[PDB]
Each structure stands twice: as structure tokens, then as C-alpha cells.
Symmetry: C3
Subunit: 333 residues, 3 copies
């Protein structure tokens, strides 16, 4: 009794930005890519299930020459066990636990989810996490779920892609369409993260909460969160980099799903850093979004995504100020 | 109603060239590689089909050490829609439209197809193409097909792997075994392509025509084509590189398919550059070919391919002059 | 009549070593990875079968940034034919023939198999091998198998990953649980291998023999082998590298498989180099091992592996002396 699904998609994707598009939100040009993966689960006995998952990213916008590898990477690589009432445990490359919150608004046709950085402690996909998860409080309280997650030190060649050891967890409740969630983690920073000109401190911290309605074809959701010494930042003007001492982040999203296949989306997003050594307060993300996805079926969809960038042109960090529109076609199985 | 085929092959492949084989056609040594991909199509309603495709190259002749990645790349990555009578549209990494012509002679057991360069405007696989295709002139004229294709600027780190924006198209007719085809595209060159010592001009151009017989177990085909500022060239003697100001290209091919599984092949190929700054006229490809494929079934074949190099040893560009023989075994599914 | 199995596993894997763990056996930290591959065989007629195989390694412990590619590689890439009584022939990336011996003890839950180096002439996976194999001496002598294998020159960018041409073979006999095997190959070294400070000679040589019991839930096996100029070595103290002039190697292993799924393992391993220019005699591997695998089913297992390192701290080459424990969870299909 083993079920494995091999899964994948090919994504025909173009970004439109005024000229450059180095001073825009999304960049400009060909952004085609494909994904492949497997997801597997085995029924060991009536109370115990084993599972694993691997997912990979193939960029489809590189030449077949020296740049062929750029942006190719594993996204997910993990296995675990799920015991009847007791819960699930898994280890590997997985979603940070705070993403159990940021998942609420990470719903745009192409952009959005700006605060769920990869290899960023608890907010995105990350390497070396042991994750425990519980549904319906041991079978006892419908809709009450929680989770804890242990993050091992990754002492990588770059500050940006590193972490020290850390712990994080999340708790959420769901009653007929509404969903409330909270998530928090902290972790040691590594001497290489600390040696950076931007960011000063020994612990990195991230939390977010999330509020959502999700029934009757409507999707409304908000997320508010903060970070100390965790959000990666770069100053376009001196080529310095490191981490934002604090940030505050809000993301809102409203969508509707028509039965004929259209799903319009409006979103708002702003993320403001504080106490950035040499600058003080400066915005990182600030935009409104309109877009839509048309779903032909479960296998085929198309979409447009328009980001109305509100970041000003004098922005102390050199964060792009121009709008970006993405157009995509998708085959997935 | 979705059909996905996962497909692939493992190819046991060796090149034999006198010693080096740095002054030969094909090189010398282990050239084993594997391919994997998916091809998917979904029936959305009775007139509209969605599809996508991804194909990858794994070299099998690298160590498991630092060179493990060499020659690995995505070949194809695209999705599109196909509407009843109206035609197909797809975007991503795909075959340049002029390859609708070069496809005629690109039929050898191992070599051949010398003019269908990758990341070369319209002649090979290329990134960032929107391709429209029409069969039987909107259902109205059996055998009359056409296609147009828009190529977006790829401003890559190398001249060789770049293009500016361009348009190209192709038209072909097929009546009981015979096939006639024509194809043409042009495109902007990028300032990096132009800054090269070899090649001077703002537009790159390529066209080819193709003539073919393909029934009763016979395959005869020819292709003639020309290029301005599009064919990539390198001068072995100064380590300079860029693009051939003009080239003229002919490729011929004759094959027969015995019912017991053998398929011998004889081919001719020559490609001559003109107005190469510092040299004038110099050949790039010039050879005869004999070889054969033995097909055990649809899954298993083997083959030999022998290239009788006619390029002389004094060739002004340092193009290899030695013969090359390839031997290959293939499992594919 | 074609059978293709797509296969794979996701492996949740952590190494524990005292602090560093740069002076240990296994290192320290996240060591998650996944594997994917295909294995295919086609029945061409009643006496002739075609087949091929490709297998790849995706590390799951890299970031999604610049280091994304580290330790990713093809492991296997080959195709061949199998003729009724006559035997099998295959070409590509495959297991060196001497591994028909080292296979005996390469059975640990995580470590072990220390002498079966990749890209190491005949002991591990290697590129460019033509391998012939025979079972039951042409159908005439049950349990008597042999094999020969031709290795083509790989003139790679590093000494470590190179070889010249070579031949190697193996012979083995199996009678109700017992198994005896012998294997030997030699090959030319390349001028780059020879230009190395460590290792002096024109031919590289490796042989091993293997003795085993394998029935009634017991697995006992030993291997003894020697090498001239083939075992790759590095001297931590001067950053010099190359090849051990001689080594002698023994590996022993004892395991039992309980029906409920547990499989404990005890192993011994030592490999001693000789005539290492600048040092004389120095150990390379020397440890005892205890560990266990618990098999939930064919799809799911977990395991611990504990290496009691016996290499001393004054070891002339800087070979790590600390213990290492690995813990792993595995989903495979
Ligand atoms: C439903 C999925 C097959 S898709 C979804 C998540 N994967 C994706 O969203 C990716 C992607 O982000 O591109 C995906 C790739 C290919 C097809 C569909 C989704 C994976 O965690 N989830 C899978 C799952 O857990 O079942
Ligand atoms: C019939 C195919 C499965 S094979 C053919 C083209 N692919 C290949 O020729 C490749 C290759 O060039 O190696 C291939 C890989 C593996 C098996 C068979 C073919 C792809 O465009 N076409 C596929 C298709 O469009 O159906
Ligand atoms: C039984 C296999 C499917 S697994 C075994 C060898 N492969 C592996 O052991 C790999 C690995 O070393 O990780 C493997 C990957 C994924 C699942 C099972 C095994 C391959 O040579 N053999 C395959 C075979 O020859 O049948």
C-alpha cells in the first residue's frame, strides 16, 4: 500500500518592466521555469503512515551554455512519519514554521509572499529542520492545530544563506471559513552574519499572525509580523549588505473564485525596516496589486499580475520603484 | 482527461578520433549522456487543448567531483494552447522557427544538423519565444501549414548566447511524401554581440529552405540556407570570436529503412562563411557522412556514425580536419 | 513489452560530531539528499533483452542561492544488451568491476564501503566503462559468474578524477549462502596524476577478494584488497595531494535481520597506506561500527550509524580522529 505521485509543471512566463528593468519590482524579460517533484506516502499499519517529498526548480530562461545552471535548486527534500492521533514528524529541507502564518497571503498569481524569504530562518524554505505537527489537538479539539520545529545551524559560505540553531512554533484555529494563526521563532546568528556592516545582534527573531476567511468562493486574508535581525537587505549604493535590525510587515489580500474559472486578486503589501545602520527608517516593499488567474481546468491555467510599485525613487537603499507586469501560461500535472 | 508521458533515454556513447582529438570533427572519448522530460496535454473542451513540455540533458561523462555539472541544461520548457481550427500558441524555451526548415536534414544517427546552433536566434533551441502555428490553413487546405514566432531580447553574459528582439516565420506544403518548406527570421543584435572583433552589423538574419521525400521507407532531403551576422564563429589562432558576416549552407541526406531494423545513412554537409574580418572566405563545416542505426524495437537501438572530414589542415580558422566515428547504444522509453 | 520503473528516495539525514566537525570521520550537520532514477528493460525477442539505467543525486542540504549545485551529480548512466546464455554487455557510467568484490561489505546503514571511491579506476562508479558479464558460465555451471570490463581514458581537469586506459575483471562462486569473489584491474595513470607530489608510477592497480555468508537472516562478509598508485590521498598539513603508493585494506561486517524489521550491524574497517613520500606508513581509515536500521516496510525505514574512530590524533596525514553518529529517515519508491 504505497501511493507515489510524480508531479510537475511548465511555466511560460514573461515580465514587463519599463526598459531596464533593474530599477523595477520584478525585473524585465523571459522568466520561464519548470518544476518537478515527487510526493509519496506509505500505509505502514492502520495508525502509522510514512511519507516523503522532493521538489526541484529548473529555470527555463538560461542558455544551454555557461549560465545553464543559474536559479536551479532543490526546493523541498524531506521524509517523516505520521502517527494516528499523536502527530507528524519530518526532517530535511522544508517550510519554516512561521510560513504557517505567511502562507495566508502567499496566494498571488505571480508575486506576493514578499516576506517569506528562502533560507531565512523560519519564514521560507530552509535546510535542516525537524518539524513536529499536530492536528485537532491529538484528535480532541477540531480546528485546533499546532506545530514546533527545530532548526540546526547552517554555516554556509554567505551571511545571507546562513543561520545558527533556533526553535520556532506555530498555533492556529479554524472554525467554518475563518482561520486564525500565530507563529514565532528565534535562532542564533552566525559570526559571519554578525560581521556584516548591516544588522547588529546575536539572536534573530520573526513572528507573524494571520487572519483569514476562506469559503463561499471568497478569499480574504491579512498577515502582520515583525522581525529583528532576520530580514536580508542590500544597499544598492555602497554594495553593502546584511540584515535589517527590525522590520514591520503587513500584507493583505482579497480574491474571488468564479465557477467559470476566473479568479481576480487584489492585494496590498508593505514592509518597512527600522534602525538600518547609516539610514534609520526605509521601506523595502510597498505596493498594491491587481491581477487574475484564469483556470481552464486542474491542468491548465493562465494569468496576469500587475504590481503598482509605491516605493519612491529616492529610497535610501535603492529598492526599485517601477511597476512590473507578469504574464504566464501553465501546464501542470 | 489529462495525458502526461514521462519520457527519457540513456545513451552509451563513444567518439573515436585520431589521438587528440582536438583537431577533429567530433572530439575523442566518452560522450555518454541521458535525457529526461515530460510532455503533457489536457482536453479542456472538444475544441481546446492545453499542453506543456520539459526536457533536460544530463551528461553522463563528467566525474562526481567539481566538473559534475558540465553540459547539463534544460532543452525545452514551454506551455501553450491549441484551438480547434485556429491554431496553436506557446511560450518558453523552444525550437526556433527556421529549424522548421533545418529539421529536414537533422536526421543523422549521431552528428549532422550542424547549422541548427543552440541559442542562435532562429535556428535551434532558444529561450523566450512566443510561437504561433497553423495546420492545413485553418482546416481549409490539407498539407499547407505555417507559423510565426516572436523572439524576445536575451541580454546574457556572453555574445555567443545573446539576441535582441526579432520576428521569424515559416511556411510549408506536403503532398503524398514530398515536403517543401521555407523559413526566415531576423532580429536585433545586442551591443555585446557587436563589440566582438568578428561580425559587424545591427540585424542578424537567417533563412533556409528544405526539400524532401519521405514515404515507402525512403528519406531524401536537402536544405539550403544563408545567414548574415548570425552564425557563431571562433578563430582558434588568436582566441577571437563572434559572428560570421555571411555564411551559405547546404546539407543533403539520404537514408533507407529496412523492415528488419537497419537504417543506413549517407549525408553531405558544407557551410562556408564570407567576409570574415581578417580572412575573407573560410569553410566551417565540410564533410561526407556514412553510418547506420539498427533498431531492435521502439525502445532499443544501436548505431555508428562516420564523418569524413573534408576541412583542410590549413583552414584559416582552425576548424578541425580529422575524421570522427561515434558508436552508441540507446535505451529510451 | 517494455518495463520502466521510475524510482527514488528522500533522505532526512543528520551527522553528529563533536563540535567542528572538521577533525571527525563523517563531518557534522545537515546531510539530507534525494535520489532519482530510471531503470528500464525491453524484451526484444525470447533470447535478447535491452536495458538502460540513469540515477541522479540531489543534495538537500544546500541553500537556494549560490551553493545550490554542490554535491549534485549523475551516479549511473548506461545501456546495454543481454543475450540468452551468452551474457550482458553495457557501456556508460557504471560500477567498476572490483566493486563486484567491495560490494560484499558495502552494506552499512550509512557509512562503510570506504575503499569504493568514485572516479577511482575500478573500485567505484566511474565514467566510460564497457562491461561484459556472464552468469552461471554460459548456463553451464550454476553459481559461477564472471565479468570483464574495459575502461577508457578520462583526461579530466583534476588528478583525483582522472584515469588512463585500463582492463579489469572479476570471478565469483555461490553455493547455498556462501559467496566467494575475486577482482583485479589495472590501468595507465595520466601525466597529471603522475605530476602530483604524492604517488609515483605509471600503472595503477587494485584488487580485492571477498568472502560471505548470506542466508537464514544472517549477513557475514569480509573483504581484503590492495592497491598500488590508485587510492587518492590528501595531506591536511601542506595541502598536498595525489595517490597512495600502496594501501592494504580490510573490511568486515556482521548483521542480522529480524523479521519484525530491525537489522543491527557491526562492522570493522582499516585501510593503511604504505611508502607515502615524506611519511612512510600512515593509516587512512580505522574504525569499528555499530548501528541499526529499522525497516517499517519496503518504502520506509529509519536508522542510526555510529563510527568509533580509531585513527589517532597525531596521524601524519591529518585524517580525522573523532567519532561520528548519523541519524536518517528514508522514504523510497
Ligand atoms: C499539491 C502539490 C502537488 S503542489 C503543492 C506544493 N508545490 C507547489 O506549489 C509547486 C510550485 O510551487 O511550483 C508545484 C509544482 C508543480 C505542480 C504544482 C505545484 C507542494 O508543497 N504541494 C504538493 C502537495 O503537497 O500535495
Ligand atoms: C516523441 C518525443 C517523446 S521525443 C521528441 C523530441 N525529443 C527528443 O528527440 C529527445 C532527444 O533529443 O534526446 C528524446 C529524449 C528521450 C527519448 C526520446 C527522445 C521531443 O521534442 N519529442 C517528443 C514529442 O514531442 O513527442
Ligand atoms: C533496486 C534499485 C531500484 S535500487 C539499487 C541501486 N540504487 C540505489 O541503491 C540508490 C541509492 O544508492 O540511493 C537508490 C535510490 C532510490 C531508491 C533506492 C535505491 C541501483 O543500482 N539498484 C536498483 C536496481 O538495480 O534495481
Amino acid at each position: 500500500g504505497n501511493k507515489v505521485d510524480l508531479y510537475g509543471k511548465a511555466v511560460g512566463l514573461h515580465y514587463f518592466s519599463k526598459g531596464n528593468g533593474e530599477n523595477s519590482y520584478g525585473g524585465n524579460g523571459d522568466m520561464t521555469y519548470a518544476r518537478l517533484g515527487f510526493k509519496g506516502e506509505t500505509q505502514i499499519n492502520s495508525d502509522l503512515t510514512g511519507y516523503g517529498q522532493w521538489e526541484y526548480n529548473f529555470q527555463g530562461n538560461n542558455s544551454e551554455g555557461a549560465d545553464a545552471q543559474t536559479g536551479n535548486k532543490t526546493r523541498l527534500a524531506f521524509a517523516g512519519l505520521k502517527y494516528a492521533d499523536v502527530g507528524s514528524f519530518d526532517y530535511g529541507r522544508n517550510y519554516g514554521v512561521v510560513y504557517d502564518a505567511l502562507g495566508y497571503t502567499d496566494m498571488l498569481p505571480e508575486f506576493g509572499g514578499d516576506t517569506a524569504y528562502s533560507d531565512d530562518f523560519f519564514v521560507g524554505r530552509v535546510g535542516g529542520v525537524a518539524t513536529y505537527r499536530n492536528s485537532n489537538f491529538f484528535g480532541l479539539v477540531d480546528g485546533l492545530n499546532f506545530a514546533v520545529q527545530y532548526l540546526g545551524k547552517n554555516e554556509r559560505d554567505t551571511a545571507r544563506r546562513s543561520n545558527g540553531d533556533g526553535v520556532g512554533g506555530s498555533i492556529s484555529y479554524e472554525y467554518e471559513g475563518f482561520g486564525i494563526v500565530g507563529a514565532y521563532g528565534a535562532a542564533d546568528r552566525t559570526n559571519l552574519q554578525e560581521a556584516q556592516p548591516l544588522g547588529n545582534g546575536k539572536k534573530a527573531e520573526q513572528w507573524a499572525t494571520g487572519l483569514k476567511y476562506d469559503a463561499n468562493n471568497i478569499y480574504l486574508a491579512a498577515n502582520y509580523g515583525e522581525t529583528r535581525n532576520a530580514t536580508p537587505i542590500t544597499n544598492k549604493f555602497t554594495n553593502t549588505s546584511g540584515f535589517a535590525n527590525k522590520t514591520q510587515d503587513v500584507l493583505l489580500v482579497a480574491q474571488y473564485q468564479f465557477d467559470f474559472g476566473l479568479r481576480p486578486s487584489i492585494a496590498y503589501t508593505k514592509s518597512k525596516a527600522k534602525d538600518v545602520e547609516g539610514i534609520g527608517d526605509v521601506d523595502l516593499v510597498n505596493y498594491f496589486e491587481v491581477g487574475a488567474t484564469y483556470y481552464f481546468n486542474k491542468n491548465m491555467s493562465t494569468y496576469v499580475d500587475y504590481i503598482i510599485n509605491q516605493i519612491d525613487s529616492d529610497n535610501k537603499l535603492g529598492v526599485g520603484s517601477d511597476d512590473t507586469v507578469a504574464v504566464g501560461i501553465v501546464y501542470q500535472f
